[PDB]
Design a protein around this ligand. Structure first.
Ligand SMILES: [Mg+2]
Lengths: 492, 446, 51, 95, 82, 252
DNA sequence: CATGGGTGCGCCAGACAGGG
DNA sequence: CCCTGTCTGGCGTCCTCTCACCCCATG
């Protein structure tokens, strides 16, 4: 009876490595809840278990509050202090109440609350101790297969889930099968699965390589990037600081044994291992393997790279359904355009001709001088307007007066283009002139400017009939805006 | 359990082992508790309600014997007043003194002082008899009662159900016309006549020529004659008519026949009994018809002619549903019908899964024991006579006898899988043990 | 006290052509007969027409 | 149905009274009602102006009787410490 | 459902009707197979006899479908192994 | 507790689940028959009247037992072997056991008969539908001889029903009862007076020609129209109905 | 306390005597 | 042994619903 409480507390404390205090607090809450259910009225109840005897006293708790909303469970601070002057806001006032007999009903409630406390203590500490597993490749047994997810048993009452998107496209699991996967997310949800496991994401590939390649687990080789088409093909980029170690050779292993072990665990996924380079162009050449790259052109402003290949290698460089270029682009972070050497030359000739036409049209220069600007690397009016004067003065035949005139023309051309677009739509010119009439929103100003009504004068000249087809403009609203425009233009 | 054994510590008592359970009673009947008896074997402590019943019956018997003494003393004093009307009467002096001394008044040695002495003998006998009988009645209430071997107290409770009528009860007349009442119609659907009154009960005519009880139709016609006389009395009395017209009509309704035995006359009833006799005749006039010397047809016709009813006994009747007339006018009247105590909420019974017998694992028999109906031998023959084979297999293996078979069946029914695992009847194993308990060696081969 | 079960034609199963079957529910424990009889007697004769 | 229906058309400021009510109408325990009467609290409008801290100073008013008063006031949508401007109305000042 | 006359017109024994309809109702109830006729929330017995009346189920077709959907399961197992 | 939601559950399980009704002295196999339940406010088993002649069940205080086929093969045996529609012929012979017993033959015998003068004597009617319309409106009598035009379907080909329409000199009641007869039977099955032997051979010829399902639905329509016109008949029994012979006393 | 010992049914049918 | 009379055994409808009462006796 008495000594049995101590023996139970000691057995549970030792077996679940849990603080005795946390078990008692929970038993007190369990007994309070079991007591509340025996009364027809909603009462507040505190239970206190004596830590030496295992005896327990049950109260009618009265949550000391400032304002009483529930007179059956709450008492004012003034009324609580009339019974005991030591009480504060948030304390409990008690009332001698018959403790519930410990029947198999309370026993079952106590068992359930202990089990729940162990889930939030023993199992929580087990998950904390398995900080590596929360991130590394956990191993589970398939408990249940549904259409949209697989439930894994990890042992110790821990359940994990693999979602349909987190599976490989050709995997078929049965109840009782062993499955490995990366624990990529732990969610403290009050309902559902708490442990989310992936086999499809790139982290599964990284951690399989960490286990299979000791040199990655010892931090001698680093995986810098991983790009993956799950169950089909992946690319990994590897670097080492030790010049004595070939990082690609280490990840492949003797006759490919290491990469084949990882591929076999991923259902026969093809894995390319590439050397990481700190030069983006050299890294993209490596990422494009097994296709040979002839030349690369880098557009830093668009964050894009044009990759020229021999006409025989084009199909290999793109890969089946663009898989090779897509995985290389995901691995590099660059947008990759794969074309032939002939197509790259034709593209550059078309861009050079478009730049020459743009410069000839807007800068009032001859085609010979526009060609020199493009040969010196200028492709946009913005570059010519904003580039440091020193770079323009390095061009053979440019003097300081001609560079100043060229920049002034480029700025005036950019301003003319801006004004043209601002009057064509409602960016600035029609967003101020046509939008002067009170009531004109930016959308209506652009709808007016699409009809050639660009200014407040153009609107003052319209009839209601000329504007009747504009979506969102009623005849009354059209008439009001035309009259507002006329009042400003003709009577201001 | 750990917590059930910890009961001593957390709360108290001891340990939760013996099943705490209060004898609660079953269902099927309503009622109102009208009378509770409590009998106590002597020596056992009377609780507070047994002392309440003891005080109650002490109080009732005390009041009853005291009222015996008071009522018989009132009759005795009325006798003393009746004797002292003559012979030394005191008209004013009689009620000046207390009433228990009505003997020493002025009166000589006659039969009257002798009678007052005899009444004094009776009065003192009643006094001492009341003393000794109240002592004996307190003894009878206070004592215990000899009872069964090893019983403390018997509580008897009298429920008082009020059972009305419903489709399924059995009613019958007095000639053999039985019947289960089949539908309790509304008022409007009843066939009414060209006065307005609905008929109460619609029998079936076809039971008359085969089941030859033609007496119920003569009883029906004579009952309609009786109610016709009763309606004419109710009409002559509801109009507040003087007693002369009531005397006329009641005399005409009581003569009415051949040489008969009755021969009453209302000229010696004196104008107050005739009103009370008509107060008793207004719901109908009772008619005696002795067994083999009864009322012939012409007398029924002459009594149906005294009321203004049709001679043939048949009124044309309208319909309640259609509101249009039934062709070929029908027979109405009054029949005296009896409710029999073969009710329908005493026969109706149903059982899914109840208790099972002990020696042969089959369900119990009866209704008070919550039992199942006997699927007898001729029903087994009638299912062999069809081709029903699985119905008979579950009718005598799964539903009845095999215990593992029926627990598998109950799990399979509450999970939606209609399927039986057959097994063997356990009563066939009882047959094997009874034949095997002789010198006979019965087995099961293979 | 004047609140009854107001009914409605839940379906008109018009069987084939020139023939319908109109079911009305729910009525009181006695109003099916009075509406059937009223509509039956009125349709039979009162309803006018030409022939 | 149209014929049969056409053949039948010839047949067919102390807040409010709540405040203006006496405290005895609140169904309070005989203890709580007698404690309020001892402090000259006659109307519901007088009770609603008093704070919980003021009612606890009243002789013989316990924490239990204060909880009863709150639960009863809450059942009527009233709370302790409401300020009524112009209470008592001049209609009550003459009793 | 009132009569089962055509379900005997298509299976002449009137005892094989009970076996075929019981086999069919056990496939529809616990095994989780769809009815081949659209129901009206009938129970599985009447849906079995309603499939018998259409003719699309008797013992021949049930043996054909059990052999083919047992060979399909063992074929799936063999192609999963090898 | 019997809450408000278990009665919908009960109307779900009762549906399409037959029960075995059984009279207590079962002598032959027609004394155990399987029905479908229809729930009753009450405490008494309502039993269809024609079926009573199989059970030897009157209603003078009789009791019956209900049994539930639990398993699925037993539900199918109750529907396919022991259903009450399947037992329409007695196994001892060829005679139908769902013969209409007592009220319904009185309703038919009063309906299909004749009298030498009634309302609508010798008028001519364009079909049985207006025969019933003349009976209901109050312009003719149920037995009044009349030429009607009936269309009897005789199936003289190999499974093809050939219509022949003609004018039969018949009564009003025989046309009203012709509205219930199925297609294949000839009109002369109702042209007579229809006692009990005649209605038994009516159901027997319907079973031999048109099979089982028209005979089940026609047995029900016989019972309904017999009960309805026996109610409309008002066929009582009086004391004057038993006519004493005037020649009886001289014979004695 | 524990144990210890009426005389109103009638037919069929085959086995056991009983003559024969 | 072949027929005759006697002597014992085996058997006689199915479901239900109440009730009442189950071994003395005693050294
Ligand atoms: Mg009977």
């Amino acid at each position: 009876m008495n000594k049995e409480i101590l023996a139970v507390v000691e057995a549970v404390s030792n077996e679940k490595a849990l603080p005795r205090e946390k078990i008692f607090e929970a038993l007190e809450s369990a007994l309070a809840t079991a007591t509340k259910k025996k009364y027809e009225q909603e009462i507040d109840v505190r239970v206190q278990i004596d830590r030496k005897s295992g005896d327990f006293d049950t109260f009618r708790r009265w949550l000391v509050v400032d304002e009483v909303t529930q007179p059956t469970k709450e008492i004012t601070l003034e009324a609580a202090r009339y019974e005991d002057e030591s009480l504060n806001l948030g304390d409990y006032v008690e009332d001698q109440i018959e403790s519930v007999t410990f029947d198999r009903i309370t026993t079952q409630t106590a068992k359930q609350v202990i089990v729940q406390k162990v889930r939030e203590a023993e199992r929580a500490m087990v998950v904390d101790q398995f900080r590596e597993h929360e991130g590394e490749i956990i191993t589970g047994v398939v408990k249940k297969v549904n259409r949209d997810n697989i439930s894994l048993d990890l042992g110790n009452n821990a359940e994990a889930v693999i979602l349909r998107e987190d599976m490989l496209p050709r995997e078929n699991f049965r109840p009782g099968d062993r499955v490995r996967g990366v624990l990529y997310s732990v969610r403290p949800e009050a309902r559902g699965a708490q442990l989310f496991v992936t086999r499809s994401k790139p982290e599964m590939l990284i951690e399989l390589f960490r286990i299979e390649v000791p040199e990655i687990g010892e931090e001698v080789i680093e995986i810098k990037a991983a790009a993956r088409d799950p169950g089909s093909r992946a690319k990994i980029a590897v670097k080492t600081n030790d010049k004595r170690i070939d990082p690609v050779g280490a990840c492949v292993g003797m006759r490919g044994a290491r990469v084949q072990a990882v591929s076999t665990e991923l259902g026969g996924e093809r894995i390319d291992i590439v050397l990481w380079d700190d030069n983006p162009a050299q890294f993209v050449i490596n990422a494009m393997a097994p296709a040979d790259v002839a030349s690369i052109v880098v557009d830093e402003d668009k964050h894009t790279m044009d990759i020229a290949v021999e006409a025989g290698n084009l199909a290999q460089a793109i890969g089946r359904n663009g898989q090779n270029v897509r995985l290389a682009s995901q691995l590099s972070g660059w947008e990759l355009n794969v074309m032939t050497v002939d197509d790259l030359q034709a593209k550059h000739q078309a861009e050079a001709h478009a730049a020459i036409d743009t410069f000839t049209k807007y800068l009032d220069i001859d085609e010979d001088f526009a060609t020199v600007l493009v040969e010196e690397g200028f492709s946009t009016l913005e570059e010519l307007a904003y580039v440091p004067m020193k770079e323009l003065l390095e061009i053979e035949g440019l003097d300081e007066p001609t560079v100043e005139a060229l920049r002034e023309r480029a700025k005036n051309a950019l301003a003319t283009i801006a004004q043209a677009q601002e009057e064509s739509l409602g960016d600035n010119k029609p967003a101020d002139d046509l939008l002067n009439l009170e009531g004109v929103d930016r959308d209506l100003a652009f709808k007016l400017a699409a009809r050639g009504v660009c200014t407040l004068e153009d609107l003052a000249e319209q009839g209601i009939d000329d504007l009747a087809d504009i979506e969102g403009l009623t005849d009354e609203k059209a008439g009001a805006l035309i009259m507002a425009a006329r009042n400003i233009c003709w009577f201001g | 359990t750990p917590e059930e054994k910890l009961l001593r510590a957390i709360f108290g008592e001891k340990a939760s082992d013996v099943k705490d359970s209060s004898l609660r009673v079953p269902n099927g009947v309503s009622g109102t508790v009208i009378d509770v008896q409590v009998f106590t074997r002597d020596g056992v402590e009377k609780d507070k309600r047994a002392l309440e019943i003891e005080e109650m019956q002490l109080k009732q018997a005390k009041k009853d014997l005291s009222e015996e003494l008071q009522i018989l003393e009132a009759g005795l004093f009325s006798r003393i007043r009746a004797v002292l009307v003559a012979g030394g009467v005191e008209a004013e002096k009689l009620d000046k003194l207390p009433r228990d001394r009505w003997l020493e008044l002025g009166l000589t040695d006659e039969e009257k002082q002798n009678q007052l002495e005899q009444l004094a003998e009776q009065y003192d006998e009643l006094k001492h008899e009341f003393e000794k009988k109240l002592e004996a009645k307190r003894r009878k209430i206070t004592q215990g009662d000899d009872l069964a071997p090893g019983v403390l107290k018997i509580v008897k409770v009298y429920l008082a159900v009020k059972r009305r009528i419903q489709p399924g009860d059995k009613m019958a007349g007095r000639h053999g016309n039985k019947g289960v009442i089949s539908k309790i119609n509304p008022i409007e659907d009843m066939p009414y006549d060209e006065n307005g009154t609905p008929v109460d009960i619609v029998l079936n005519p076809l039971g008359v020529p085969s089941r030859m009880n033609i007496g119920q139709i003569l009883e029906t016609h004579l009952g309609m004659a009786a109610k016709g006389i009763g309606d004419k009395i109710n009409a002559m009395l509801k109009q507040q008519q003087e007693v002369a017209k009531l005397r006329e009509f009641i005399q005409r309704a009581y003569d009415l026949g051949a040489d008969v035995r009755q021969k009453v006359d209302l000229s010696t009833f004196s104008d107050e009994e005739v009103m009370r006799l008509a107060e008793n005749l207004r719901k109908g006039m009772p008619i005696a018809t002795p067994v083999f010397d009864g009322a012939k047809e012409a007398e029924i016709k002459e009594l149906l002619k005294l009321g203004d009813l049709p001679t043939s006994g048949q009124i044309r009747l309208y319909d309640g549903r259609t509101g249009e007339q039934f062709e070929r006018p029908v027979t109405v009247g009054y029949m005296y019908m009896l409710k029999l105590n073969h009710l329908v909420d005493d026969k109706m019974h149903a059982r899914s899964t109840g208790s099972y017998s002990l020696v042969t694992q089959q369900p119990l028999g009866g209704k008070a024991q919550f039992g199942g109906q006997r699927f007898g031998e001729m029903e087994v023959w009638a299912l062999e006579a069809y081709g029903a084979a699985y119905t008979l297999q579950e009718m005598l293996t799964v539903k009845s006898d095999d215990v593992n078979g029926r627990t598998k069946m109950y799990k399979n029914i509450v999970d939606g899988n209609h399927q039986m695992e057959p097994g063997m009847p356990e009563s066939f194993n009882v047959l094997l043990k009874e034949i095997r308990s002789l010198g006979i060696n019965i087995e099961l081969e293979d | 006290v004047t609140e009854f079960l107001k009914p409605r034609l839940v379906d008109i199963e018009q069987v084939s052509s020139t023939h319908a079957k109109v079911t009305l529910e729910p009525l009181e424990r006695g109003f099916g007969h009075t509406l059937g009889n009223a509509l039956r007697r009125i349709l039979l004769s009162s309803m006018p027409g030409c022939a | 149905a149209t014929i049969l229906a056409e053949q039948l058309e010839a047949f067919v400021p102390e807040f409010d009274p709540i405040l203006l009510r006496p405290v005895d109408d609140l169904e309070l325990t005989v203890r709580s009602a007698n404690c309020l009467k001892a402090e000259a609290i006659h109307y519901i409008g007088d009770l609603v102006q008093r704070t919980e801290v003021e009612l606890l100073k009243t002789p013989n008013l316990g924490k239990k009787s204060l909880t009863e008063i709150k639960d009863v006031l809450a059942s009527r949508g009233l709370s302790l410490g409401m300020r009524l401007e112009n209470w008592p109305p001049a209609s009550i000042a003459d009793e | 459902r009132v009569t089962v006359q055509d379900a005997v017109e298509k299976i002449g024994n009137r005892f094989d009707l009970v076996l075929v309809a019981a086999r069919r109702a056990r496939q529809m109830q616990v095994g989780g197979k769809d009815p081949l006729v659209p129901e009206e929330n009938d129970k599985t017995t009447v849906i079995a006899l309603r499939e018998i009346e259409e003719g699309l189920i008797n013992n021949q077709i049930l043996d054909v479908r059990e052999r083919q959907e047992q060979q399909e399961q063992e074929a799936a197992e063999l192609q999963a192994v090898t | 507790r019997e809450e408000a939601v278990v009665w919908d559950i009960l109307d779900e399980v009762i549906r399409e689940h037959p029960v075995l009704l059984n009279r207590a002295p079962t002598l032959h196999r027609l004394g155990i028959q399987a029905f479908e339940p229809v729930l009753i406010e009450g405490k008494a088993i309502q039993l269809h009247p024609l079926v009573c002649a199989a059970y030897n069940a009157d209603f003078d205080g009789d009791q019956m037992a209900v049994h539930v086929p639990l398993t699925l093969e037993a539900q199918l045996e109750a529907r396919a072997l022991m259903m009450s529609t399947n037992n329409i012929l007695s196994p001892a012979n060829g005679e139908p056991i769902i013969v209409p017993s007592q009220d319904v033959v009185l309703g038919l015998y009063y309906m299909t008969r004749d009298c030498v003068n009634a309302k609508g004597e010798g008028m001519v009617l364009t079909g049985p539908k207006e025969a019933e319309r003349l009976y209901r409106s109050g312009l003719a009598s149920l037995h009044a001889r009349v030429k009607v035009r009936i269309t009897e379907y005789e199936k003289d080909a190999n499974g093809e029903l050939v219509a022949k329409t003609s004018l039969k000199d018949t009564t009003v009641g025989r046309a009203i009862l012709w509205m219930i007869v199925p297609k294949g039977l000839p009109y002369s099955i109702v042209n007579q007076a229809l006692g009990k032997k005649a209605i038994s051979k009516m159901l027997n010829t319907c079973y031999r020609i048109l099979g089982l399902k028209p005979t089940v639905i026609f047995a029900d329509q016989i019972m309904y129209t017999g009960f309805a016109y026996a109610a409309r008949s008002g066929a009582s029994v009086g004391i004057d109905d038993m006519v004493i012979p005037e020649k009886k006393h001289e014979i004695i």
